[PDB]
């Protein structure tokens, strides 16, 4: 888990993450304190998928 800090973009993340032995790369994308979408890319050139999370439930609920 690596929280995104400051000014960095997804296309620059993927090339910066493939060089350290990583395979895929998820991005949880909240808005207004609810998580609504999820994108996962495939490194370094693989297909990138943009789902949207829905009917979200935690483990406590």
């Amino acid at each position: 888990f690596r929280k995104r800090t400051g000014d960095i973009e997804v296309h620059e993340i993927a090339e910066a993450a493939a060089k350290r032995g990583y395979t895929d790369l998820l991005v949880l994308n909240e808005d207004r304190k609810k998580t609504n979408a999820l994108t996962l890319v495939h490194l370094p050139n693989g297909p990138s998928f943009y789902f949207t999370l829905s009917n979200l439930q935690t483990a406590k609920e």
Binding site: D7, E9, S54, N55
Partner: protein, 50 residues
């Protein structure tokens, strides 16, 4: 002196608009896409049915 005061203040205020909207246009910022009530009430309807 009142009128020339305004023009110089609306020059400081129009330059700050171009010096900002140019930097703002060059950053990479998320896409404000609209939500649609007809197509989020359809999903919620067909979710529990599926």
């Amino acid at each position: 002196g009142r009128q020339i005061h305004r023009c110089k203040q609306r020059l400081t205020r129009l330059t700050q608009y171009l010096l900002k909207a140019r930097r703002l246009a060059l950053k990479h910022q998320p896409a404000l896409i609209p939500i649609k009530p007809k197509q989020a009430h359809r999903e919620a309807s067909r979710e529990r049915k599926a």
